[PDB]
Symmetry: D2
Subunit: 295 residues, 4 copies
């Protein structure tokens, strides 16, 4: 036997950082969950009980905190890049660092119409994420995403004209509910290293904003032919707006809301045009994916 | 043996309702999870395999949908009261109905600065809940709450002057982070029945708003001596503002954010006044509760 | 305003303990999650920012670990009683301690047909729990339970003869699946204090065993008329077998498994006697409860 | 823009099947969660609102139930292969089917020392899974796994001799707790199609058994130098025992159990050789991975 692939490190590292403007009194908080997994000439830790080649996962954990202390933690693409670069540079025998960051929302509170200097609210479980692969000799590969963005529209969703055969029961509809949890990922052009990432720093927050904005507007305004057609419109607009991204991926569940026939009860009419009360279905769910690039 | 207590019914009933203004095109959605448990002369279903006294939980489920079809689902205190009243009136041998409702947020989207007529976003897992106990001969007992409201303040929290003995290691602090998940409950004066509930309908949304507002403002503005002292200030203000509530309950976890001593590494200073990077603790957590009434 | 009720302390305290037989080499592990909430003359911590009366929740946490170090952690009824007794005795102004313990399973592994001396497997998320209320002047009130015991029987469950009216759609059935998550609680006679608890120590593991055994056997062997009738048979047998318990409570979801009509497809027969493939329903679910005591 | 990748279908399809021996009265149950995602000439559903090429996810759902009705659902490698093969054969323009199956445990109950004919218990959340990729023209790629197998050993785990530098605080230890959630995957040799899968059917249950057995025995008996070294021993034995598998992957969290220094309290000794009470850590956790193949 032989080791074909190996990576190890520390997962679920919770991190908070605060910035305090002693001038204005305004504080700003950041909270994330970090995973760092290393690759390199480590196969003998597996095959020969050779721990000498292991940078302890506890030490990886310390390094995450120390790096947060000494560097910006925003945007997460930058923090991820600094952290991964540290491991491959610091340790000769480590040749890749895989950095995953989940950013948790802490939105400044408005109290009586004015932003509060140090109080925050978690306005949803929507996350901003990065996946940063720092590979010695091959630069920095970054995937950015938003996830957990849950939306619903009550009309202007349709689903008709699909294939019909002996396995098909679904009725065509020209007016349905559409609800999903948006998972959207934009893949950056390969960066040659930390310097190139630094040179593009303002583009990270901006592209996240754009992706978020395009998603919400297209969802709200598209009179949707299908989840497939709607998600494609989102991806093409994001690509059009950021030349440094190579692909946009969407993964969308179709979280079904079923009509409830109540005509068996006093002839109550609750279907089609009379549909008022629906049963949200927890499972099963459609799952629709696509990766869009440029022609 | 004998049955000392019994209740049965349907839990986790997911319900959606839409309202459509055909005049304006504006749609409004409501989504909830409902539980209805009945009590009454049902002990022989347990002791004698006498199913004749059972209103099927499947029928309870149907009844929830039918009631949503034929009545307002807002405010949830009213819907809960109508639903519970239905069971005790419809079935002679049913003498109490216990209605729990969790309301899920669907906040209208703003697209390019304007509210969209039929698109919504789940802006957090914060819930609005009710517990409605409809008891034949003894009216309607309503508990209203907000839960899952997650907040953090980065300063203006303190914890010193607590009891110190041989079990105490905790250092006194005059400046810490405070973060919690707010669970707040206001208990209404007993209502004599559905008519009395109806007579107070506008007070339900208003008192929820007040509770929410008082919570957020007191959290943001109190230079907190402890979770105990802060939560009491919230409760007393809510009581002061709604004479029809008898008590206000808070249940607050203290979600700890620990300083990280980094002085072992290149003498980095990250404690006290230099504290920038913290480790959020998933567990354990303080849990602080109180029920406040009027003197 | 005034404080009507108050309790505070530390929740989600994870605890492991190991016992090592240096003679035999056999080790035994225990793992739990503990919550301790105190009551007493603490209202001024809420109303007057008077922290002097607060035994820090961090100190409560320390005390849980120290108590585990110096006392048996099994049975959990005893450990809970020692822990609660400690707080009301140690602190004059603390008058009740509320101790909740969740015990996690670590079952010794058998390797090649022989029990291993120090390796364990989590054979399910079923828990053994206690709720121990230690109230100064009023002894120790103990509720013991098993929860998360998930079972299914594929036949010998029936549900017919229930009330039928205009809200009823459910078909009567003489052969269905029954599946539940068993939550069963036995309430002990009040104990006067820690000494009385000590005097009954062997009865705790034994009564848990009995409850577990009666549950599984009655579930497997009862040709069930309903969840109600089956659960009552469990409770009455447990009561018959332990005079020191006053009541037995069951809370059982009916986790529905629906037939799937496939006759629309090539006349496939998959209902009634031909029913082979079913759709397990995640929600809604029946929820059936009863508290049984002696006549 | 252009579609670079696309797949769509139905996720979280819960399925139960029962087998009844009318001769013996013995029933056997199977329960799973299924996801089927299709690929093919479907890009115009995304780019042109062309639903004609969509096999409805609702129809995919029906097909899963119908396939379960008409075929064995065990072993899951076979069921997955039949299901995926169906889509690529039935639909000319569908060229791959991705079938993920999670199998839930329903272990026959023993009642008074004898196996019960139709009653079952969920003896843990451990799963048996498959990932079956059916690709037209390129056969069937199968990955089998066990996951959620949670174990602990109380001694005979060590971790010393690892790299020490200015980021290292962790003390070397020659006796620690080791606990993990085992995720183990064996990758089968490519199969040319459904016939080849059929020809190996008995090897699926057998290799799952072997993997399970090797995991538990190696965990219990290895005096572990590290998670890395232990997991490698598991993988090499599995490979040695099934020539038709090409690689074995492990993904293991190191679920840390920390010593608790209690010497600050009455000089209590609870570290090193005196270590009895530990604090299980929910996060962070080590995460150790490797993919082992043959030399
Ligand atoms: O937008 C949809 N896409 C599908 O592929 C599909 N399939 C289905 O049943 N409903 C829908 N809806
Ligand atoms: O606000 C607090 N209340 C307490 O009761 C307590 N106890 C503790 O350890 N920290 C805190 N903080
Ligand atoms: O055992 C049952 N009890 C009920 O009360 C009930 N109600 C229902 O719809 N199914 C069942 N099954
Ligand atoms: O078995 C281990 N492997 C590691 O790589 C590691 N790192 C760490 O901190 N503890 C351990 N333990
Ligand atoms: Cl779908
Ligand atoms: Cl606290
Ligand atoms: Cl039921
Ligand atoms: Cl580790
Ligand atoms: Na390197
Ligand atoms: Na009645
Ligand atoms: Na006392
Ligand atoms: Na095909």
């Amino acid at each position: 036997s032989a080791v074909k692939a190996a990576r190890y490190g520390k997962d679920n590292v919770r991190v908070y950082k605060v910035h305090k403007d002693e001038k204005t009194g305004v504080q700003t908080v950041y909270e994330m969950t970090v995973c760092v997994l290393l690759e390199g000439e480590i196969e003998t830790s597996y095959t020969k009980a050779d721990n000498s080649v292991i940078v302890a996962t506890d030490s990886i954990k310390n390094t995450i905190y120390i790096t947060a202390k000494q560097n910006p933690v925003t945007p997460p693409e930058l923090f991820g890049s600094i952290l991964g670069t540290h491991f491959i540079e610091k340790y000769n025998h480590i040749h890749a660092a895989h950095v995953n960051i989940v950013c948790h929302r802490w939105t400044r509170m408005d109290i009586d119409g004015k932003p509060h200097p140090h109080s925050f609210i978690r306005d949803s479980e929507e996350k901003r994420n990065v996946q940063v692969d720092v590979v010695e000799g091959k630069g920095i590969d970054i995937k950015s995403s938003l996830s957990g963005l849950t939306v619903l529209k009550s009309t202007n969703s349709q689903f008709w004209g699909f294939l019909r055969d002996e396995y098909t029961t679904l009725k065509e509809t020209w007016d349905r509910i559409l609800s999903t949890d948006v998972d959207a990922t934009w893949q950056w052009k390969n960066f040659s290293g930390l310097q190139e990432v630094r040179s593009h720093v303002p583009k990270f927050d901006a592209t996240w904003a754009t992706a978020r904005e395009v998603t919400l507007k297209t969802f709200a305004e598209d009179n949707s032919a299908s989840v497939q057609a709607t998600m494609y419109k989102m991806a093409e607009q994001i690509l059009a707006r950021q030349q440094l991204i190579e692909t946009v991926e969407y993964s969308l569940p179709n979280k079904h809301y079923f009509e409830i026939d109540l005509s068996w009860h006093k002839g109550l009419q609750n279907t089609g045009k009379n549909a008022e009360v629906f049963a949200p279905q927890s499972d099963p769910n459609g799952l629709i994916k696509c990766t869009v690039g440029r022609s």
